[PDB]
Amino acid sequence: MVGLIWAQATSGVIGRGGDIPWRLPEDQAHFREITMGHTIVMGRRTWDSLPAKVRPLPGRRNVVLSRQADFMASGAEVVGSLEEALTSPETWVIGGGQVYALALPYATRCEVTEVDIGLPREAGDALAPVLDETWRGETGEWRFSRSGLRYRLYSYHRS
Amino acid sequence: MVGLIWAQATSGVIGRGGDIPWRLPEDQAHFREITMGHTIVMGRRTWDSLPAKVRPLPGRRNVVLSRQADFMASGAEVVGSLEEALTSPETWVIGGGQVYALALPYATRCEVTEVDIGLPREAGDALAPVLDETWRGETGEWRFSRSGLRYRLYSYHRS
Ligand SMILES: NC(=O)C1=CN([C@@H]2O[C@H](COP(=O)(O)OP(=O)(O)OC[C@H]3O[C@@H](n4cnc5c(N)ncnc54)[C@H](OP(=O)(O)O)[C@@H]3O)[C@@H](O)[C@H]2O)C=CC1
Ligand SMILES: NC(=O)C1=CN([C@@H]2O[C@H](COP(=O)(O)OP(=O)(O)OC[C@H]3O[C@@H](n4cnc5c(N)ncnc54)[C@H](OP(=O)(O)O)[C@@H]3O)[C@@H](O)[C@H]2O)C=CC1
Ligand SMILES: Nc1nc(N)c(/C=C/C2CC2)c(-c2ccc(C(F)(F)F)cc2)n1
Ligand SMILES: [Co+2]
Ligand SMILES: [Co+2]
């Protein structure tokens, strides 16, 4: 099982300026629940976005994709291809835009948090992947984050 | 990864008289999508409940759990303990009531369809397992089947 997990604005923006223009504790808790115990695969830029204090994310096999053969990610594995990272029963691809696109052919689940923020797309933004017809999606109810933004979860799935 | 998948009335009834006392085509398509490609494990009574013309379920490794040492299920593997049945990247336990109770301590996910049908629990009924607070899951909310019944999906997980 390869899954993708991401949060996006309604416009599809998932990152900007190397970070994320919102922060929902409730979604972070859902992210921890879904990924705990499993492999997490992330691009190098997303690894760079994690403060050294918090990485590797605990209780998970942290894997970083990089084309730099000598890149060092203390507490993680750095691999040069996505296929190397797929040696567990569950692998969660946790970003960013480039790695979601690369991992989509391998995936059977996308856990997508939609953030009710009106965020027009900018040059340089990282964007969520386009999901074609093969994906089956249950659209959850709008929830109120304590941050003030509404959000809802889509659990997309395909065989 | 061991998951349980079932559809229940709100009361918890999943089976009666060797049958499922409703029809929900959207749930069947959902069950097909989640189980396709994977191992499916079922108790002998559930295997018996499938007409020979529609078993084994296509595209899945069908496994039947029975205490009869040399029971034959043409088109499936027969095992005498759930543990022999599991061997998986991904196994879905597909019923019925006895096998769900046996399998729950090994499960990390339950995919539950709840059918809004006023079905009282009756002596002899097959019942769904009742899930702890340790099973964290969203809560679907009510959808309308072309069968005319109302239904919703729960995706339970525990870390
Ligand atoms: N909203 C959300 O849910 C999430 C948002 N984000 C955001 O996403 C943004 C970063 O995403 P993005 O900019 O797309 O960068 P990524 O995080 O996708 O990392 C891109 C890097 O991954 C490596 N890489 C990419 N493709 C390959 C390949 N085929 N083979 C080997 N290595 C590869 C390269 O590393 P190198 O350059 O070292 O070779 C590349 O520079 C940030 O803003 C971040 O905050 C991230 C995760 C979740
Ligand atoms: N709504 C739904 O999602 C579903 C509903 N159903 C319904 O459920 C009902 C059947 O459920 P149920 O009556 O509980 O029967 P099960 O389908 O759970 O089969 C029970 C049988 O499995 C075998 N078995 C049970 N425990 C063990 C064990 N520990 N070791 C080895 N073998 C074991 C025995 O077979 P033997 O007697 O051969 O030893 C036992 O008779 C039917 O009405 C069916 O339609 C079924 C699946 C899904
Ligand atoms: N959600 C959920 N879980 C399940 N384990 C099952 C079925 C298990 C098995 C093998 C008999 C279903 C399901 C599928 C098809 C039908 C219908 F063919 F009768 F229409 C009814 C119910 N649905
Ligand atoms: Co699957
Ligand atoms: Co898990």
Pairing of strands B143-144, B150-157: antiparallel
**Could you tell me the sign of the dihedral formed by the alpha carbons of A50, A54, A56, A61, in that order?**
negative
SS3 of residue B47 by DSSP: helix
Among B37, B140, B157, the residue with its CB nearest the CB of A138 is B140
What is the Cα–Cα distance from B65 to B82, expressed in whole angstroms? 7
Enumerate the H helices of chain B as residue ranges. 25-35, 44-48, 82-86, 97-103
Among B1, B33, B37, the residue with its CB nearest the CB of A157 is B33
Enumerate the H helices of chain A as residue ranges. 25-35, 44-49, 97-103
Of B86, B69, B90, B87, nearest to B78 (Cα)? B69
Whether A157 sits inside 8 A of B34 (CB atoms) is yes
Is the CB of A97 inside a 6 Å radius of any atom of ligand 1?
yes
The strand pairing partners of B65, in sequence order, are B43, B79
Structural domain for A129, as ranges? 1-159
C-alpha A100 to ligand 4 mean position (Å): 18
> Which CATH number does the domain housing residue B133 bear?
3.40.430.10
The strand pairing partners of A143, in sequence order, are A151
Compute the radius of gyration of chain B from its Cα atoms.
Answer: 15
Amino acid identity for residue B60 in this structure:
R
Atom of ligand 3 nearest to the CA of B24: 20
A33 contacts in chain B (CB < 8 Å): 136, 157, 159
Pairing of strands B39-43, B91-93: parallel
Is the CB of A6 inside a 6 Å radius of any atom of ligand 1?
yes
**Could you tell me the sign of the dihedral formed by the alpha carbons of A135, A138, A142, A144, in that order?**
negative
Among A89, A138, A155, the residue with its CB nearest the CB of B89 is A89
What is the Cα–Cα distance from A125 to A15, expressed in whole angstroms? 6
**HSE-up (13 A, CA, CB side) for residue B102:** 19
**HSE-up (13 A, CA, CB side) for residue B1:** 20
**Diameter of chain B measured on Cα atoms:** 44
**Could you tell me the sign of the dihedral formed by the alpha carbons of B52, B54, B59, B65, in that order?**
negative
DSSP for residue B25: H
Domain count, chain B: 1
Resolution (in Å) of the shown entry? 1.8
What is the Cα–Cα distance from B114 to A105, expressed in whole angstroms? 31
DSSP for residue B80: S
Which technique? X-ray
Gaps after residue numbers in chain B (C–N over 2.5 angstroms): none
Distance from CA of A157 to the nearest CA of B (A): 8
Distance from CA of A28 to the nearest CA of B (A): 15
C-alpha B6 to ligand 5 mean position (Å): 19
Cβ contact B155:B33 at 8 Å: no
Region label for A99, one of left (φ > 0), alpha (ψ between -120 and 50) or beta (otherwise): alpha
Cβ contact A43:A64 at 8 Å: yes
Atom of ligand 3 nearest to the CA of B6: 3
Q: What are the φ/ψ torsions at residue A22 (nearest 5 degrees)?
A: -165, 175
Q: Would you tell me which residues 86-105 of chain A have a C-beta closer than 8 angstroms to some C-beta of chain B?
A: 89-90
Region label for A65, one of left (φ > 0), alpha (ψ between -120 and 50) or beta (otherwise): beta
Which ligand is nearest to the Cα of residue B42, counting in written order? 2
What is the Cα–Cα distance from B99 to A50, expressed in whole angstroms? 43
B157 contacts in chain A (CB < 8 Å): 33-34
Q: Which residue has the tokens 């809004």?
A: B116
